[PDB]
Structure formats: structure tokens, C-alpha cells
Amino acid sequence: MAILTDENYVDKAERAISLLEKDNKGNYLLTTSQIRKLLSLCSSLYDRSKERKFDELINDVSYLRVQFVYQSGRNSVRVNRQTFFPVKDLVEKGQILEALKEIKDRETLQRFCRYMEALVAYFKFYGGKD
Amino acid sequence: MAILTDENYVDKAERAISLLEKDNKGNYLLTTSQIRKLLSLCSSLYDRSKERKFDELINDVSYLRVQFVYQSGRNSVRVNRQTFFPVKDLVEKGQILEALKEIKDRETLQRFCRYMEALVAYFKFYGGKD
Amino acid sequence: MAILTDENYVDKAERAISLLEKDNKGNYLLTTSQIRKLLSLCSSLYDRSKERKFDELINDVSYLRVQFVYQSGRNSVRVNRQTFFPVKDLVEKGQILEALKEIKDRETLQRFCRYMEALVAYFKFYGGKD
Amino acid sequence: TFAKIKFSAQIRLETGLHIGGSDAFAAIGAIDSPVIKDPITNLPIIPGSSLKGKMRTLLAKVYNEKVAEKPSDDSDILSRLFGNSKDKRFKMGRLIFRDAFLSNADELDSLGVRSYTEVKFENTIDRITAEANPRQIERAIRNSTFDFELIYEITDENENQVEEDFKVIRDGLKLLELDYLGGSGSRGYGKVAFENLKATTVFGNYDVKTLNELLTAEV
RNA sequence: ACGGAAACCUUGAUUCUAACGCUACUUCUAAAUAAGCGUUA
């Protein structure tokens, strides 16, 4: 049983980012600067999955996972004496780590990178800031 | 009920382009360069739909939807101390996302691609810029 | 009231061609290469109208109208520090866009195609370059 | 006496290069100034149009003897090498530039890099308000090398001009070394070097020993 | 049991040869990842 399939990842990203925490004014707490490194690493992993075999990209996925955990744990936004952690909220509401656990070949890796594409696309669609 | 039919899509593009946001000088806010990637993806999808079945075109359609929702939020123009989203305005007024959601077979996919062609044709006919 | 009838479309093409704008040297700003695709599509539609019924020709008429407006909005010539749209002018003075909306059967389609042939003949008769 | 001589070199960057392209292959979440890239491999490239244009503009300040308002108004020694659309004599030039592609990706990997393009963060600081506006610019990695190929043709029109065209090619490459390949090179971008610069007669019979001596000695 | 009967306007023929959608053109121009440390103790 996989959480990401070719028939649901775009709608999954839709629902995942429509549930992200918002300020009292309605703006998203997440910004593109907080996830810029993760997006760059996902883009590079997608680029390198086309040429090289999956066994060569065994350290890149692990680096991507440790980057996801580090960024989710370190990014904090404080408004109105309340501190939220938008990257961790995005990771748990998008099931990023669980999807990363189901990466075992080129197909699943490319599906995950397309899922991240969809996540940031729809984040920008609903008023996400740079 | 379907919003794109063989009898109404050209008139639908006619009605949608006339309602796009304009500056106080009367010229459009959307440019062709903002929708260049979307037009290229629609053209490639339409070309490739002729030779192969819709069963393995699902990734291309999902990526097309992802790119539409991304380019809607990415492209912003600041004019007269006010932010505008021209691609988002075009997508919301032409019902691009709702027409994409109706794509289930080759006929609907080609109808959507022809509708996009009609939209850009009428945008250029009404003095739209590159 | 039908603008194109079997008795005046040749004269309409004649007056339209005489009303087309020219350069400082008296040369036609419109060229046959600007309308080559439109003429090819008109010829194919006329050829297909003889055997196939108008039910399957509606998509071809819609695409023909889309091509007409796209070429009206796309082709532009800048001469003497002034820009002009030769295809748009030809469409306006020749009264083509709303002559397309009255295409409801085979007879109206063939009337429009013969009107386009007359327009080309009288455009070449008055010095229209290729 | 027709012949073709291939000047082959390694364009090794001394600084990050930003030749700059469109958003056709840009990332879906990147507010960047993307560089021109190969459509398949998504690797940075050095287009031959950039090299030809920059070299032609640089050699126009040394080999014209008259300021030219257009590339068509260029001198004969440069029109016969780069081409001239308003000259029946020089309408087809003797120089073919080629797109340069990354040729040491393995060495860069062994050096410990994660991607072949980095993102440099700059800003502009307001001098009245001390307000900083940031930007991100994509660049190719500093130690990248690109395969450079330049084909020079020799016909009977090159009867007594090859030794001058060779000198002009050397001077153009040297001027490119004391300049920057296309980008924001006024802030320290696009410094390049030509390594292993050698000339090989790939077609016909020609002697390139002396030329190769000035290539590998004068550089 | 008719100015009538019998009779192929027929055979053989490539709308073919030659021709680069080509020449010239830098995705370019300026820009420190930087500023502010109050008040209480």
C-alpha cells in the first residue's frame, strides 16, 4: 500500500497544502525561502534519476531525508507571541517522510519528486509568498 | 454537464478573453511570455495524443495541471501600487482548471488543447502582447 | 439578413480589396504568405464539404475561425515608424469574422469558400505580392 | 587546397558563469536567473552564439581601424572570419563555432559537489536608506570544463591569409581570457581559461606545427 | 425482304532533370546578503 500513486498525487498535494496553518489575516505561514533547499535537492534528484541507476542514488535520497527532517525542525515563525513551524506542518500534512520511505526505484523517486512539484505549485497558487 | 463542447469553446474563449484585467491605459496585463510554457506543454500533449492512447498520457495531463496551477501563482505584475496575477485571472475566467478536471479520454484532451489555442488566438486578436 | 449571397460576394471581395490599405509606394502591405495557411484550410474545408456532412465539419469551421483571428492578431508590419495589421485589416474590410458565424450548412460554407477565392483573385489582380 | 583545421580546447571556468536562458528548464519553485541548459541532461552549456558574439565584439575593438555601428560595418579581416550578410565576398565565414558542453562532471562529483549549478545570493543596498533588496543568480560551478571546438576552413581564398586568420583567432581567444564570457561579469563572473589549446587538421593536408607552437607557448 | 451487314479512334509515352529556407546578431545592462540595539536592570 503506497500513499503516492500516479492517479492521486496532485489532488493529495491540493488537500495537503489547503490544510496548512494560516495567520489570522489569512496568509500562509510557510514561505518559499524556507523550502528552497529542499526544492533544489528534489529537482537535482529528479534530474539525476533519468541518467544514473537507482543504486547510485542511494545517498542522495538519504541526504534529502535528513535535510527534510532538519528543515522541519529548524524553521520557526513567531507571530502574536505564538511560534509555529511551517516546514514541519507541511511535512506532516503532506506525509513527506512516509512517501520518502516508499522510494525504492526510479519510478517511486520520480513520483515523489513530481509530488513535491505539485505541492509547491499549489502552495504558490493559494497565495504563498517567496 | 461539460463546460467545453465542440459548439461553444471558441465562443467561450471569446467571452473569457474580453473579461481579462486591463490597465488604465486599456492594454492587457497578461503577456504571451507568461503562458509560453503552458502553450508549449499543451501543444506537445496534443501532438502526442494523436499517436498514443490516453492510458499512459495521465502523467502528461497531471503535469499540465501542475504547471497551470504553478504559473497562475508565479506570474505577478505590480502596476500602479497594486499586485495582479494575470495567468491566474485567465485560468479562473476561462475555467482552465475545471476544463482540465473533465479530461478523461482523447476527445476531451484534444478539445481542451483546441480551447487553449482559441484562447491565445483571441488574446492576440484583441491586442495582447508577447 | 445574410451578408454573403450568391449574387454579391464577388463584388464584396472587389470592394474589400479596393479598400485595403497600402504603403507609401502603393504596395499592398498584405502578402499571400501571411494568409497561406488560411487559404489552405479554406480549400480543404471546401473539398471536404462536397462529400462529408456538415455535422463533422463544425470542428474544422471552428479551427478555421480560430486561425483567422490568430492571424489577424499576429501578423504586423512596421513601416515608416508605423505599425499595421494586414490580416486584421483584410478581415475587417472583407467582413469575414461574422461571415463565418452564418456558416450553418454546406451551402453557406461553400459560399464563404468561394468568397475567399474571389478575395484572393482580386487581391492578386491589384498587385498583391506573394 | 581545401582543408579544415579544428582548434580544440578546454574552457575551464575561473569563476561561475551565468550565460542565462529562459524558464524552459527552470525549477518549479525557483525564483532564479536560470542559465542556458541542455534540454535532456539539464546541464549548463556554453552556446556557440555567446562565444562568437563576445569574441566578435572584442575583436572589433582591435581589428577595425574605424568604429562600426553594426556587425555589417565590420572590417574585412573580421568579416571574412565571422561572416557578413551585406557582403557577397564574405557572406559565409571561415569560422564555425560549436556549443560547448560540460566535460568533467565526473571530476566535479569526485570533488564532492551535489549539483553542477549553484545559486549565488546578492543584494543591492540603498545608499540613502540602507535598505537591501536581494536576488538569486544561477551560475555554473567554478571548476567546470567545457569541450571547445572551433573549425577553420581553408580554400583558395585563403591563399595568403591563413597566417593572419590564425593570429586573429589567437587574439580573440586571448581577449576572451582577459574578458568575461556573457553574464554579470562586471561583478566578477564568467572568467574563463583555454587549456590544451591545439589545432588539428581534421580535413585535407595542412601543416599546423608552427601554429601549434604559438598555441601551446604563447597561448 | 431497313444504302443495308461486319469494324474499339486503338497501340507505345514517368509532368521528369538541377536547386542547403540560407547569410549577420553576446539573454545583455547597474546592484556588498545587508541595516536598526531602544528602554529597564
In Å, how far are A57, A68, A111, A119, C39 from A105, measured between CA atoms?
Answer: 9, 20, 10, 21, 52
Beta carbons of A121 and B66 less than 8 Å apart: yes
Q: Give C67's contacts in chain B (Cβ within 8 Å).
A: 121
Could you please report the per-residue DSSP string of chain C?
Answer: --S--TTTHHHHHHHHHHHS-B-TTS-BS--GGGSHHHHHHHHHHHHHHTTS-TTTTHHHHHHHHHHHHHHHHH--EEETTEEE-HHHHHHHHHT-HHHHHT--SHHHHHHHHHHHHHHHHHHHHTT---
Q: Give A125's contacts in chain B (Cβ within 8 Å).
A: 69-70, 72-73, 88
Beta carbons of B70 and A10 less than 8 Å apart: no
Can you say whether the dihedral through the CA atoms of B80, B82, B86, B92 is positive or negative?
negative
Q: Give C59's contacts in chain B (Cβ within 8 Å).
A: 6, 114
With H, G, I as helix, E, B as strand and everything else as coil, classify residue D190.
coil
Question: From the CA of D180, how many Å to the C1' of E37?
Answer: 43
Amino acid letter for position D165:
D
Residue B54 carries which DSSP code? G
The residue in chain A having the minimum alpha-carbon distance to the alpha carbon of residue D115 is A44
The alpha-helical segments, DSSP class H, found in D21-140 are 48-59, 76-82, 105-110
Does the nearest atom of strand E lie within 7 Å of D53's Cβ? Answer: yes
Amino acid letter for position D126:
D
- Name the resolution in angstroms: 2.7
Judged by a CB distance cut-off of 8 A, whether residue B98 touches chain A is: no
Q: At what angle do helices B58-74 and B86-93 cross, to 10 degrees?
A: 130
Does the nearest atom of strand E lie within 7 Å of D18's Cβ? Answer: yes
Judged by a CB distance cut-off of 8 A, whether residue A23 touches chain D is: no
Q: Give B117's contacts in chain C (Cβ within 8 Å).
A: 66, 70
Structural contact between residues D45 and D36, judged by C-beta atoms closer than 8 angstroms: yes
Does the nearest atom of strand E lie within 7 Å of D110's Cβ? Answer: no
Beta carbons of B66 and D23 less than 8 Å apart: no
Judged by a CB distance cut-off of 8 A, whether residue B34 touches chain A is: no
Does the nearest atom of strand E lie within 7 Å of D183's Cβ? Answer: yes
In Å, how far are C18, D54, D151, D200, D211 from D7, measured between CA atoms?
Answer: 60, 17, 6, 6, 10
Domain segments of chain D as ranges = 1-219
Q: Which three cell numbers stand for residue B123?
A: 488574446
Structural contact between residues B31 and B38, judged by C-beta atoms closer than 8 angstroms: no
Beta carbons of B37 and D28 less than 8 Å apart: no
In Å, how far are C88, D13, D181, D182, D186 from D55, measured between CA atoms?
Answer: 43, 16, 9, 10, 17
Does the nearest atom of strand E lie within 7 Å of D84's Cβ? Answer: yes
The upper half-sphere exposure of residue B96, i.e. CA atoms within 13 Å in the direction of its Cβ, equals 30
